Amino acid sequence: MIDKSAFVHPTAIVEEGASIGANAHIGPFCIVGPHVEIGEGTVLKSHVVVNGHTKIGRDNEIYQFASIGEVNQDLKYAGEPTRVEIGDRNRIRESVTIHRGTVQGGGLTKVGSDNLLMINAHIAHDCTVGNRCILANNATLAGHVSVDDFAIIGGMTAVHQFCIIGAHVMVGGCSGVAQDVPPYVIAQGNHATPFGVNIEGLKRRGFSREAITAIRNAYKLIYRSGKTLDEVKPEIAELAETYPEVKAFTDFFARSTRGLIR
Amino acid sequence: MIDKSAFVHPTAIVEEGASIGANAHIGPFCIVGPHVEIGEGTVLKSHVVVNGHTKIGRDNEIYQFASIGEVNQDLKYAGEPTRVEIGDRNRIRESVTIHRGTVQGGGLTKVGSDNLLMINAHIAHDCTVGNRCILANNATLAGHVSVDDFAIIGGMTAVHQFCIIGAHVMVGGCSGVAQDVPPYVIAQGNHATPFGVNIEGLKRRGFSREAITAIRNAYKLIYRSGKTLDEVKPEIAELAETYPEVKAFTDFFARSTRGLIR
Amino acid sequence: MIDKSAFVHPTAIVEEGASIGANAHIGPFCIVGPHVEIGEGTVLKSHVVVNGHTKIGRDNEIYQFASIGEVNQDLKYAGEPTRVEIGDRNRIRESVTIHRGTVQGGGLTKVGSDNLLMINAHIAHDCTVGNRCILANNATLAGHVSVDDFAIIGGMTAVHQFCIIGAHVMVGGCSGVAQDVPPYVIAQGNHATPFGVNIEGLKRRGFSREAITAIRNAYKLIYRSGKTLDEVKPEIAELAETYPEVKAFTDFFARSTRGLIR
Numbered sequence: 158m159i160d161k162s163a164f165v166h167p168t169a170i171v172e173e174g175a176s177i178g179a180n181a182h183i184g185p186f187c188i189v190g191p192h193v194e195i196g197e198g199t200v201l202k203s204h205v206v207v208n209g210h211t212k213i214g215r216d217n218e219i220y221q222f223a224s225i226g227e228v229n230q231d232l233k234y235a236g237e238p239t240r241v242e243i244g245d246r247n248r249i250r251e252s253v254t255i256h257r258g259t260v261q262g263g264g265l266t267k268v269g270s271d272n273l274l275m276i277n278a279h280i281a282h283d284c285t286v287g288n289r290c291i292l293a294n295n296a297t298l299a300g301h302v303s304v305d306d307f308a309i310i311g312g313m314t315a316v317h318q319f320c321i322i323g324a325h326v327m328v329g330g331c332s333g334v335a336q337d338v339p340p341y342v343i344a345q346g347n348h349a350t351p352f353g354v355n356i357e358g359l360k361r362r363g364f365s366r367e368a369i370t371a372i373r374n375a376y377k378l379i380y381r382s383g384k385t386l387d388e389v390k391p392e393i394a395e396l397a398e399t400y401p402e403v404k405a406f407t408d409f410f411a412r413s414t415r416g417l418i419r
Numbered sequence: 420m421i422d423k424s425a426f427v428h429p430t431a432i433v434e435e436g437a438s439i440g441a442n443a444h445i446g447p448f449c450i451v452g453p454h455v456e457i458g459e460g461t462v463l464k465s466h467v468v469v470n471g472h473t474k475i476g477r478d479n480e481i482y483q484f485a486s487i488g489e490v491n492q493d494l495k496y497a498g499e500p501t502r503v504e505i506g507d508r509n510r511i512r513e514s515v516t517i518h519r520g521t522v523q524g525g526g527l528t529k530v531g532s533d534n535l536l537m538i539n540a541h542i543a544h545d546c547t548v549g550n551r552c553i554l555a556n557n558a559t560l561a562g563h564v565s566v567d568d569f570a571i572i573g574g575m576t577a578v579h580q581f582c583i584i585g586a587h588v589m590v591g592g593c594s595g596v597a598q599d600v601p602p603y604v605i606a607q608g609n610h611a612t613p614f615g616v617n618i619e620g621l622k623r624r625g626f627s628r629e630a631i632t633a634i635r636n637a638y639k640l641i642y643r644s645g646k647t648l649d650e651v652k653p654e655i656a657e658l659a660e661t662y663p664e665v666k667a668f669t670d671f672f673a674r675s676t677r678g679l680i681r
Numbered sequence: 682m683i684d685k686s687a688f689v690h691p692t693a694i695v696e697e698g699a700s701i702g703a704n705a706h707i708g709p710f711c712i713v714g715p716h717v718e719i720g721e722g723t724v725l726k727s728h729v730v731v732n733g734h735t736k737i738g739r740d741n742e743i744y745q746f747a748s749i750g751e752v753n754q755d756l757k758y759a760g761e762p763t764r765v766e767i768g769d770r771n772r773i774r775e776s777v778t779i780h781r782g783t784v785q786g787g788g789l790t791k792v793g794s795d796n797l798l799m800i801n802a803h804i805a806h807d808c809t810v811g812n813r814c815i816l817a818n819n820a821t822l823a824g825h826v827s828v829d830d831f832a833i834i835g836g837m838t839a840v841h842q843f844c845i846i847g848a849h850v851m852v853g854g855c856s857g858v859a860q861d862v863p864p865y866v867i868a869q870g871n872h873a874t875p876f877g878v879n880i881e882g883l884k885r886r887g888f889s890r891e892a893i894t895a896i897r898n899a900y901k902l903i904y905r906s907g908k909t910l911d912e913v914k915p916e917i918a919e920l921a922e923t924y925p926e927v928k929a930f931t932d933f934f935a936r937s938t939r940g941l942i943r
């Protein structure tokens with residue numbers, strides 16, 4: 158159903174079955190499929206295609222030439238009714254693509270809230286983007302990539318399939334990420350390597366100096382101690398008992414499958 | 420003429436003169452020029468621009484915001500009635516651009532069959548893409564580039580004008596290809612360099628172990644022997660008399676103009 | 682007002698207040714906002730969005746899926762009535778984005794005349810592009826970037842915020858520019874470094890051999906002398922008294938804020 162207070166441009170094509178929330182705005186030449194849900198106050202500027210089994214939250218701004226919920230690019234995909242979930246207050250810029258999941262990959266592509274996805278950012282099938290992230294122009298995620306809370310992916314940067322980009326990470330522009338990036342880490346290069354802790358990001362986000370110190374110490378255990386990851390895991394866990402922010406490392410390690418960028 | 424069984428959306432603009440085949444589907448807000456031929460069963464999803472002297476085959480899927488047959492970006496081009504040919508069963512994704520040829524470059528941009536051209540792939544004037552190729556997101560071909568059968572161009576990768584990407588090549592993501600890549604070769608970097616034979620690709624495509632061995636031996640003659648290309652050409656030709664797959668090298672050498680990546 | 686000789690496609694949406702000049706052509710499914718001025722003979726092919734406080738000159742060609750005058754991607758922007766200015770005879774290709782300025786950055790994004798902006802080129806808020814420039818496919822300018830007259834930005838190349846790309850510069854494809862590039866310089870790499878003078882560009886543009894020699898000598902003072910920039914500035918200024926072309930360096934130094942690529 159289309160809410161009585163939603164605006165639907167006469168030139169827009171909203172298929173019967175679509176759910177459009179209160180004070181939503183569907184601009185000129187948009188197409189909205191029958192399995193799409195668009196939340197209260199969400200705006201599709203113009204020339205937006207939303208299809209598939211796709212749920213979009215509240216107060217989103219989706220710009221022209223974006224394609225949301227579209228068939229993914231995995232040759233394994235066969236037309237199964239897979240899904241996209243997008244949260245609230247995202248800014249999804251011109252030409253952004255967010256593709257539906259695959260059954261093989263869990264069936265769901267998910268984007269959280271308060272993210273900025275810049276021009277031609279690509280969120281492939283089975284990706285999970287958290288909250289407060291930034292993907293700069295042309296930032297490209299292959300299938301099954303996680304981008305955790307507050308992580309920033311620089312302009313022109315691509316991420317290899319299955320990789321995890323940890324919370325509060327900053328990946329520099331013109332980079333190629335081939336392995337997992339621990340939380341709080343600055344990454345740059347092709348292929349990307351680690352360049353210390355994202356101190357500036359943590360400062361601005363209200364991290365205490367004790368927490369930043371602890372995180373820096375965890376970083377040093379991983380990259381400067383000369384020990385294996387298996388050796389330092391318990392040390393990092395111990396540190397997390399005093400500084401809860403360090404637990405982010407422990408949680409990340411349990412999800413990591415591709416090894417760490419080094 | 421538009422076939423009686425073709426669907427043309429009321430909002431689509433198909434110019435008189437366009438040929439649209441049986442069971443083709445022209446989606447909302449598409450524009451199809453008067454010199455365009457669209458084959459049986461081909462689908463233009465929505466918001467597709469097809470113009471120029473452009474022939475498109477059967478069972479193609481062309482996604483929103485793609486531009487096919489458009490004026491090329493060569494400053495030398497002056498509006499001459501040059502051409503685009505696209506074969507059958509291609510998947511041409513969102514924002515892909517395929518531009519018409521130039522008179523200077525032979526007048527034809529050609530794409531074969533069963534290719535996957537991912538989001539914002541660019542096929543410049545006078546390019547020739549073969550069959551079963553993959554161009555990943557933002558893969559960019561400059562003018563007069565050949566991409567031979569089964570070749571894969573990784574995400575964010577660009578190819579310098581006049582370069583030949585050989586059959587069964589795999590070019591890694593985030594690469595810049597400045598010279599010719601022999602068939603069967605793995606290429607990566609900026610500028611791209613060779614990293615052995617695409618053994619996995621050949622395996623999956625049904626190449627015998629004898630053929631793969633012969634190809635590896637040819638690779639070694641080129642890159643490991645320390646001999647010049649002129650010296651090894653006849654040796655490679657001799658090898659091809661037993662293993663026909665090696666002839667791909669010989670055929671490639673005769674087309675190569677920019678030297679080999681090394 | 683819309684000039685009596687301008688063409689506006691029945692499917693195009695031109696908002697009352699828009700100014701459209703003589704013999705302009707607004708193609709199918711274009712949207713033109715109420716604060717837009719489009720000059721004599723300018724063509725919007727189809728599916729173009731032009732909005733904001735945006736002035737576009739004469740004889741421009743703007744291709745499908747381009748977005749001109751749109752809200753910029755700076756999180757600092759709050760909806761202020763900032764501006765875009767575009768000059769004459771530009772070729773603005775498919776999916777190009779040119780964003781409005783920010784109050785913080787001076788309020789104006791400016792593009793000159795006779796430029797070629799290739800597919801998915803991005804001109805961020807507060808950028809200044811001069812005349813006769815080329816931005817190749819996916820060339821991406823961050824905020825507040827200057828691209829001076831005749832400068833060429835290669836395919837897939839990104840430029841860090843606040844950087845100045847000097848007059849007659851050639852930046853190679855697949856590059857990342859993190860600092861200022863003096864006029865006449867060839868730049869390449871990630872991050873980009875200098876590779877001598879753009880001799881070929883200068884030749885073609887009618888530079889005398891005496892001027893090219895003087896420019897090469899200035900280049901050598903900067904990069905080969907082993908002296909600091911402060912030391913060579915007066916030497917370069919002295920040289921400019923005989924060869925006026927060298928003054929471009931002096932003018933550039935006064936604008937440069939990020940240091941020189943080295």
Ligand SMILES: CCCCCCCCCCC[C@@H](O)CC(=O)O[C@H]1[C@H](O)[C@@H](CO)O[C@H](OP(=O)(O)OP(=O)(O)OC[C@H]2O[C@@H](n3ccc(=O)[nH]c3=O)[C@H](O)[C@@H]2O)[C@@H]1NC(C)=O
Pocket residue numbers: 229230231232233279280281282297298299300301315316317318333334335348537553555556571573574575589591592593617618619620621
């Ligand atoms: C330096 C960083 C650069 C990163 C650049 C990333 C660009 C991403 C662009 C967005 C694409 C996205 O929308 C689609 C998605 O990534 O699909 C794929 C899907 O996520 C995956 C898993 O489900 O499966 C497919 O990719 P792969 O064919 O690479 O599968 P794989 O990762 O499981 O295969 C592993 C091995 O195949 C090897 N291989 C394959 C083919 C070949 O010819 N040669 C070869 O060696 C390759 O070396 C690799 O080690 C899928 N592809 C296709 C074409 O079907």
Ligand SMILES: CCCCCCCCCCC[C@@H](O)CC(=O)O[C@H]1[C@H](O)[C@@H](CO)O[C@H](OP(=O)(O)OP(=O)(O)OC[C@H]2O[C@@H](n3ccc(=O)[nH]c3=O)[C@H](O)[C@@H]2O)[C@@H]1NC(C)=O
Pocket residue numbers: 491492493494495541542543544559560561562563577578579580595596597610799815817818833835836837851853854855879880881882883
């Ligand atoms: C590390 C790999 C990075 C690859 C990045 C590739 C990005 C491609 C983006 C797609 C563009 C495509 O759609 C258009 C096509 O490539 O057009 C050109 C056309 O294929 C060509 C031949 O016909 O001619 C033109 O390109 P060039 O101006 O480079 O011609 P050229 O290759 O024959 O010139 C050779 C020499 O010119 C030199 N040059 C030119 C200008 C200058 O200011 N300085 C200079 O040195 C340059 O160094 C080079 O060695 C054409 N361009 C223009 C702007 O007219």
Ligand SMILES: CCCCCCCCCCC[C@@H](O)CC(=O)O[C@H]1[C@H](O)[C@@H](CO)O[C@H](OP(=O)(O)OP(=O)(O)OC[C@H]2O[C@@H](n3ccc(=O)[nH]c3=O)[C@H](O)[C@@H]2O)[C@@H]1NC(C)=O
Pocket residue numbers: 275291293294309311312313327329330331355356357358359753754755756757803804805806821822823824825839840841842857858859872
């Ligand atoms: C190798 C070259 C690669 C280049 C790649 C360029 C890709 C450009 C894509 C186009 C984007 C453009 O349309 C938008 C524009 O660039 O916006 C920004 C605006 O031009 C800027 C100044 O006004 O301010 C913002 O960028 P920054 O957040 O980087 O501001 P800054 O440059 O003043 O900050 C300086 C320091 O912040 C540091 N920082 C920030 C966050 C963080 O988590 N960690 C961190 O270290 C960072 O290291 C840097 O040294 C703006 N961004 C946002 C998201 O608001």
